Design a protein that fits this description.
GO biological process, one term (chains B, F): cysteine biosynthetic process from serine
Pathway (chains B, F): Amino-acid biosynthesis; L-cysteine biosynthesis; L-cysteine from L-serine: step 1/2
Catalytic activity (chains B, F): L-serine + acetyl-CoA = O-acetyl-L-serine + CoA
Binding site for (S)-malate (chains B, F): 91, 156, 183, 190-191
Oligomer: homohexamer
Organism (chains B, F): Neisseria gonorrhoeae (strain ATCC 700825 / FA 1090)
Strand content of chain A: 5-15%
Chain lengths: 241, 242, 243, 241, 243, 242
């Protein structure tokens, strides 16, 4: 029972986690607290992100409420979350259940955390946004600037070392592997703009204010420095069509 | 340097740690608790790994007991010792055996994965995924529990190492940080199979269900095809060059 | 109002007072980390101990150790002040001085390494290795305590930086994340790069072996240098080639 | 501006704590998190009790939600809380502000914690009630059995060592000092029944299923073993009119 | 189904399985504390270490220390089993055996003291004092490690119990909270009460000095005994007097 | 027994703690951190008190700095030493000076109150109340910050000690656990004033604004009237008897 078959994402996740809780008594109270006691997927996400990023400095209850108010202020974030989960199930062979990336894929956590961060930054809570950016970098190994604008349908697989700068913009239905850099090169627009459908391979660098066309493919380890036409595969250092 | 290439690994480690404990009073109770109070190397490893990966969610006592019950698989301890010896052999920055045991996160990631693999094969999949995620957070190393790892492994520096579900590694292999043993929507074998003796340089990507031959040499390269034994491949994309 | 227009410490205190007044969630944190301190170095010791403290190593003890270290070599504080200024110069994402001080893990990794180097030279090797491992865990940055780093350093984003035992870095250098200053061989001795003043290294660049990198050279992103590089040369490719 | 003068309890507490937060920068984020960010007194109470009684075993977020749902299920508990605060302001010379016992009087915390405990016990959550009873005993030094029934207007001053058994019942507007025992003497009714208005002195023992009349006064250190008529002062070991 | 109608351990495991199934908030806690263990003594060591552990003293280390202690003197476990049965006998509020095991701080204080006494006799005096202080903080109960306690003990409610260095308690005794088994004088030696089998002491009763309390005596609540008490006598008052 | 009645308190404490640290490896890093790494007794006291009373809300580093800045009042350290000597004099269970310093919660409650009193007089009332509540939770001792305490105090066992806002205690006093120095709606002086040399037995209640004379002796008694000097009072209610 999946979305490319039948469907309720939330109900399916609850059934999966109920099975898991019954199977592993070591984690049951965790799964009841993180998931089963909640009434919406967004509440679960806020709770788990607060567990990940909480500190003595930033109480987990306070961060939980902040993420809850954020998700309730911006309804589109929950839509993006659900889209990303569906994308991970579609594209990742290692994903056999929906709760799997929800609970255990640090790239998914980094992306959704950034979404909330972006919401806080736009509201003027810049200091808190920087605090959470630093904490996301520490715990997830992923540095996304709060100003970065990311679309829906994103899968950040493995994730370790992903960087996205202040002025980066990503379209919808994009797949990024670990080690990828969407880096800069004086302020202003200076970070990549990635189009819908693009797939970026592991340890690929995309530098500067350059456009990457729809359904382009950036090979693993490549270094892109100029714009890339849509539907082109570029490979090499520097990358070439 | 009374070492294995000049012997009791466990006794040597205990002597090193006794010296350290006497020297640094800030860490002595730590070294007594992690090492000196234990009767076997495997118990020390379980204790330290649980210290690293423990959380409020997962009590350190429970994780310690789980790792000891796992260590059921006596051969894992053998692999641990092998890996330690390899690190002493191959790493110039390793002058003592307790050094990687306590402070090298690549060694910790590899041994943690070994225990994880044991838990996964026994059907404790949820805990295996939980611990995989925690290994990724604390060590910066993502090894899928299904991955099959041989003995004599050295993962130096480690930050960013990835190994997918279907990856298989032989014996006496040396991997640097940033290395990717990655895949290429459809399941099945899709992660590299690395042969005994191979050396992979930093930030090297090996993608897909491809075989890497005995004593091959792969820094920064991107392999997409199989590699014959005893070949040095370099470049993006990789090409034989030696 | 910046250093190119000045007291770094006073400016940082003003910025942090503004932030504390703005965010009530973080006010006590900013008062404890910054406003209650009398010197920038004390703030640095406090924040680093907050980052790297553990149940094994009490934060009060690590704080005192970092304080005694900074007092042992006053010049370390100078380097700290240099590095902050460098980031303000070179990083477009840096609009305030307390920003990297509090939230840039590369800056924290560099200063932590400085203190580590001080402890290692004093013979506190076990603690140096402990803190190296902890820096690797929390920051994702592996710098060997023996590594020699000059002033004016910016380690942007930082995740995955590695620098071995015999690495030496000059002054006014800019390094991005994923960069490797790595070694070669099983035999000890000089085997890690020596980077000259002014060099810029792009993301995920590997520099391997006991090789010299000349003044104001530029190592392109993703490049792999295995030979020495003349001064004022841009090298690109795998392996890197002059251009 | 007090209740025996003018009045909004909640607004007054918020003003007091805003003053405190502005005065002590060491505690400001605490006072914003415990009080100023909340919309009702009951939410503040749930939060602070969760801070007190939270553990690694029992996450503070989970306990916070449990106390919130409890207070929302039983509206009378909040009324009792407000009554108790007013009683402490009335009767305790050391209470010059309303937020003072709210945040810093462990007897007040023990009483309100017990109220929530009683709610959980009546709902059948007996194991959780026992867990929280043990934790209240550890942190507050106060052992109140979850089944005990306590009225409103209670002040438990200093509190250390207060004990109240399974079948104890306390009326309204009662004042109890530290060390007081409402103890037993085979099951069944075996714990005191205390009437409205009674004042019990420090280290006084009241043992058995005995009635204590309205507006009685039990002297400090006394040991009561028989019923006490209303409006009588009893003192001694054993206590005598 | 109780011990007066039997396996204590099996009954406790059944009770805790029921509780775990009933309360999902506490299931992993009950599995870790009880169900994953193979003996009651292991459960006791685990729970006591949970109570008394700290950042200074790792819970794994304290757990191992309590385990080794219990293994050093198997008879301690017998006393534990005795005490639990006593509470079930004597406490109306006890309807299950795991109830005092998990939630009665007097039971925890008594068993903690037993292990403490074992460590003290073995010469681990510094740790014994550490754990005495920690027991005093968490349980509100001060028992000197040298104190000698028999089996069949019920310390109900417990808050404020004190027993000095030279105190000795027989078997099958019932003590309420606030009770003092205290000393007198600045000179060491025997100076703390010796209580005989069967005695019942009421809440906030003080028994001071090196005085013997006879078999099956009853010390009324709030009483202050300063002289020896004959067996099978009820004493009441301040100071206590026969009745 | 090289002691003060047979001298350097600080050096003796350091020697005792060095012996203990060498003997118990489980606590050595603790004893080095709490005591041996410090240069003065007052710093040790600030460190240990912050360890006891620290929380996630109140960082131990901040509380440590606050206690050191308080200790501004040099005389407090004198009182600390006096109290320690008293405990050695009067308590048979005290054979070493570091014993109450590290493990006697009555000593900790008294010294914590001293610092609290200093903070309260300086106007840091909110923090004083916070720390009073924490002292009540951790030590089971409720001392109002306004309470005025003399030197040479021994609070043995301590659990349940209460001292109200207007209480005043002289010098060289011995108090057992459960003792109440309580009050009796209207503010003003309403808590006992205890004279030098007095001894109060366990679970004794002294209520109201009443004077207790020099070298008076009060276990379980309830005093409601003033007590002349050099009188033993016993009973509920209390009566002179010796």
């Amino acid at each position: 029972k999946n979305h490319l078959n039948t469907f309720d994402l939330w109900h399916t996740i609850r059934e999966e986690t109920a099975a898991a809780a019954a199977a592993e008594p070591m984690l049951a109270s965790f799964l009841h607290q993180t998931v089963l006691r909640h009434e919406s997927l967004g509440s679960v996400l806020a709770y788990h992100l607060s567990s990940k990023l909480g500190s003595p400095i930033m109480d987990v209850r306070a961060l939980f409420e902040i993420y809850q108010q954020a998700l309730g202020s911006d309804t589109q974030i929950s839509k993006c979350v659900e889209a990303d989960l569906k994308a991970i199930y579609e594209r990742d062979p290692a994903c056999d259940e929906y709760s799997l990336p929800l609970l255990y894929f640090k790239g998914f956590h980094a992306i959704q955390a950034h979404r909330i961060n972006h919401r806080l930054y736009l509201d003027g809570r810049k200091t808190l946004a920087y605090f959470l950016q630093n904490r996301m970098s520490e715990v997830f190994g992923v540095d996304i600037h709060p100003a970065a604008r990311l679309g829906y349908g994103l899968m950040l697989d493995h994730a370790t070392g992903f960087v996205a700068g202040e002025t980066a913009v990503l379209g919808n239905n994009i797949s990024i592997l670990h080690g990828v850099t969407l880096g800069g090169s004086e302020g202003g627009d200076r970070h990549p703009k990635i189009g819908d459908g693009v797939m970026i391979g592991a340890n690929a660098s995309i530098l500067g204010n350059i456009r990457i066309g729809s359904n382009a493919k950036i090979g693993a380890g490549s270094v892109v420095v100029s714009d890339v036409p849509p539907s082109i595969t570029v490979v090499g250092v520097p990358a070439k069509p």
